Every structure is written in C-alpha cells, then in structure tokens.
Amino acid sequence: XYXXXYX
Amino acid sequence: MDPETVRIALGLEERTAAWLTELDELGPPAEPVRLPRGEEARDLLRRLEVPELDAEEIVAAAPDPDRDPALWWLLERTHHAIVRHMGDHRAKPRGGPPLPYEGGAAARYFHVYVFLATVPAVRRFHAERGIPDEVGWETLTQLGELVAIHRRKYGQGGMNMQWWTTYHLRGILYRLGRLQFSLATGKDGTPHLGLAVPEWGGPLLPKAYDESLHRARPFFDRHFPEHGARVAWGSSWMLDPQLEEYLTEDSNIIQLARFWTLTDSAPEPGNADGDSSILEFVFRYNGQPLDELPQRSSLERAVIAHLKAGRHWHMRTGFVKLP
Ligand SMILES: CCCCCCCCCC(=O)SCCNC(=O)CCNC(=O)[C@H](O)C(C)(C)COP(=O)(O)OP(=O)(O)OC[C@H]1O[C@@H](n2cnc3c(N)ncnc32)[C@H](O)[C@@H]1OP(=O)(O)O
Ligand SMILES: *[C@@H]1O[C@H](CO)[C@@H](O)[C@H](O)[C@H]1NC(C)=O
Ligand SMILES: *[C@@H]1O[C@H](CO)[C@@H](O)[C@H](O)[C@H]1N
Ligand SMILES: *[C@H]1O[C@H](CO)[C@@H](O)[C@H](O)[C@@H]1O
C-alpha cells in the first residue's frame, strides 16, 4: 500500500 | 499561462505534465474561484473543524491571482476538475499532485484552498439532493481531521489527502454518525455503499457502529433513490483475521469484524502490501525505526510484534448486508 484509490 | 510554465514554476515532476495538459484543456470554471478571506474564512474553517493553529496559518497564506499566478492557475482548474464530476462516483478520485513545500504555506495548504473554493458547489449539490444541513456539514468536517493528521505526521501544516477529499467534494460520500458511506459500484456495476471509518469521533463502539448501519439505507434510498445498494463493502487492515492473535475480546474491531463476510482469498504470507496501510492508520507512519514507535495500546504492541516476527499484515475485503 500507502496510496489509496479507489480505481 | 501554459501548463509547462506552471509545472516548472511550481517544481512539479515531469510525470504531472499529462494532468496539467488535461487541466489546460478543461480551462477555468464558469463560476470563477472565490476564496473566503479574513473572518469569513475563519468561520468556515471552524465549521470544518480545522484546528485553530492551522486555520490562522491558512488564512494568513491565502494565495493571490497576481502574486501567485501559477498556483492560482492550478487552483482554478483543479476546482473545475472536481466539480465537473459532482455526483459522479464512476469518475476516478483525481485531486491532483501535492505541491513541493519550497512554495511555502500556500503550496502546503493548496488543497485546503481547493476544498474551501469548492464548498459552495458541494453544498448546492447537498441542497439539490435534499441532504440535511447537519449531515452535509458533518461530512465536510473531515477536512479538519485530515489537516490535523498532516501536522501530526509531518510536523508542519498541510493536507496531502486530496484524492480522498474528492469524494466529499463531489457529494458522493456522507458521514452518517460514526461511519461514512460512499456511492460505489462493484466491477460488474452492481451498486453498493463503500464503508469508511474516519479517525475523529472516538472508539468504534458497537452501538455507534449499529446506528450508522441503520442510517445507510434510509438515507441513500431517500436522497439517491436511483442507486439502490443492499450491501456495504469495506477493504481494511481492520478486517485482517490475524488481529485475533493479539487483540482481546473487549476489542471493538474483534467484536464487529465477526459480522463481516470476507470475500477475498487468504493472502500469501509473504505479501507485504498491507503493512503500509496498518502502519499509516495506527501510527501515521513516516519511515521511522520500528523501535521508535509508541507502544501504549494493545494494537500498537500487536502491529510491531507481528512485524518483528517476520510476519505481514493484510488488507482484507468483505461485506455486510444493510439493515
Ligand atoms: C471492524 C468492522 C469495520 C470493517 C469495515 C472496514 C472498512 C473501513 C475502510 C477504512 O476506512 S480503512 C481505515 C479505518 N480507519 C482508521 O484506521 C482510522 C484510524 N483508526 C482509529 O481511529 C481507530 O483504530 C478506530 C476508531 C477505527 C478503532 O478504535 P477502537 O478503540 O474502537 O478499536 P479497538 O477497540 O479494537 O482497539 C483495541 C486496542 O487498540 C487500541 N487502538 C485502536 N485503534 C488504535 C489506533 N488507531 N492507534 C493506536 N491504538 C489503537 C485501542 O485503544 C485499544 O487499546 P487497549 O486494548 O490497550 O485498551
Ligand atoms: C472504490 O472503488 C471500488 C470500485 O469502483 C468500489 O468497489 C469501492 O467501494 C470504492 N470505495 C469507496 C469507498 O467508494
Ligand atoms: C481510506 O483512506 C482514507 C484516507 O486516509 C481514509 O479517510 C479512509 O478512512 C480509508 N478507508
Ligand atoms: C492504480 O493504477 C492507477 C493507474 O490506472 C494509478 O493512477 C494509481 O496510482 C494506482 O497505482
């Protein structure tokens, strides 16, 4: 991780 | 201005050029960007629960179209790129890149200005959808939480979770008590509500959790009748059954996860992707040595112990039917 989304 | 000049002035990486071209083509919004100033800005920041220290700094640093032309160009078009998707949960959450902190307080708080400039538009959407004012405001208060988190994590004022605030600002996410729910769809397009848990608001007590769940269908069926979700979906470090090794029966997470049906496969033990998620949410981790992290709570001790053991934490995905 450490990023996010949601795509 | 041209996007290449903006990029260079702001110190933005070459990779952001595509985005800036997008924004160049989109152009300025029909309704020109208006930043609140002075006591108006202080009143709004306070309504959004931004800590006093940060709010004072935000008001002080507010940028100007003439002195900050590259930043202003980006602010206008970033705001536009959000409101163009008002109500639209099928659009990706693109809030734009963070600005290098060499640009000072205006750069650090850039996405706060984006959020402030966009409050009128989303509140108009709230009204159009018949959303109660107190729900609208309660939703938007996560700005203050995210601002406070930036300072805890990095030591100075900022807000670098602009991808997440695109949900609030497009009117697709609502805080209904302790939990938030977003309009969402599965891969096959089936509507559901995405569940999230904001940090502020105290422990995830079962009664508070239960109340929020009871609010979900009536709220969305009233204001977004076209959606028609029957289930809530969550992906979280909190759904990892490995927590059961470490947390006791009085744990809110343990009690409430028992209601969830996990829909992903048991992850590979060597998969380390979920480590950064649990470290962000438990510690707001910023690369420091694991020994240096606090150990006051059972969860804090648990995260580190498990990692020290050579083991990994996993985001897990599941659902609960909406009552
Ligand atoms: C579980 C059912 C929900 C499943 C759906 C998941 C979809 C959600 C998608 C997301 O939003 S992922 C991000 C979720 N949000 C966060 O992680 C926000 C930051 N976390 C928190 O604020 C708390 O972790 C939270 C309010 C969510 C829960 O706290 P609780 O206190 O209710 O949890 P619990 O009762 O299980 O805690 C057990 C122990 O760990 C401690 N603890 C819990 N969260 C902690 C934390 N975040 N940092 C340090 N300690 C923490 C807690 O104080 C307690 O310490 P002691 O046993 O020593 O008394
Ligand atoms: C993230 O997007 C995916 C698919 O669009 C969806 O399944 C999930 O619920 C979304 N998350 C939120 C919080 O809306
Ligand atoms: C995903 O990340 C968001 C930003 O940290 C957070 O607000 C949300 O609770 C989580 N599901
Ligand atoms: C998922 O993939 C998208 C591109 O489709 C990225 O923008 C995102 O950062 C994540 O890696």
Q: How far apart are CA B66 and CA B171, in angstroms?
A: 31
Q: Are B49 and B141 in contact (CB under 8 A)?
A: yes
- Cβ contacts of A6 on chain B, cutoff 8 Å: 93, 184, 194
As annotated, the residues of chain B forming the CATH 3.40.630.120 domain(s) are 173-323
Q: Are B112 and B159 in contact (CB under 8 A)?
A: yes
Q: What is the total residue count of chain B?
A: 323
B187: Cβ contacts below 8 Å, ≥ 6 apart: none
Q: Give CA separation, B51 vs B108, B146, B147, B152, B249, in Å.
A: 16, 10, 8, 12, 35
Q: Which residues pair with B233 in a beta bridge?
A: B194, B319
Residue B280 near chain A (CB below 8 Å): yes
Kindly determine whether residue B163 and residue A4, on different chains, have CB atoms separated by under 8 Å.
yes
Classified as helix, coil or strand, B304 is: helix
Q: Is B204 exposed, middle or buried (0-12, 13-18, 19+ CB in 10 A)?
A: middle
The architecture in CATH of the region B173-323 reads: 3-Layer(aba) Sandwich (3.40)
Resolution (A): 1.9
Q: How far apart are CA B142 and CA B167, in angstroms?
A: 11
Q: Which residues line ligand 1 (CB under 6 A)?
A: B 195-197, 199, 203-204, 234, 236, 238-239, 247, 251-253, 256-257, 260, 281-282, 297-300
Classified as helix, coil or strand, B146 is: helix
Method: X-ray
> H or E stretch including B239?
none
- Show the beta-strand stretches assigned E in chain B: 173-176, 179-185, 191-196, 231-236, 261-262, 316-321
Rounded to 5 degrees, what angle do the CA atoms B27, B32, B37 make?
130
Q: How far apart are CA B192 and CA B319, in angstroms?
A: 10
Tracing tokens 């979770």 back to the chain, one arrives at B161
Q: Is B185 exposed, middle or buried (0-12, 13-18, 19+ CB in 10 A)?
A: middle
Write phi, then psi, for B261 (nearest 5 degrees): -110, 115
Q: How far is CA B184 from the centre of its chain?
A: 15
Sheet containing B191-196, strands listed edge to edge, beginning at the edge strand earlier in sequence: B173-176, B179-185, B191-196, B231-236, B316-321, B261-262
Q: Among candidates B115, B108, B194, which has minimal Cα distance to B155? A: B108
CA dihedral B188→B174→B144→B123, nearest 10 degrees, is: 110
Q: How far apart are CA B295 and CA B125, in angstroms?
A: 44
What distance, in Å, lies between the first and last C-alpha atoms of chain B?
53
* A1 in contact with ligand 4, CB cutoff 6 A: no
Q: How far is CA B91 from the centre of its chain?
A: 16
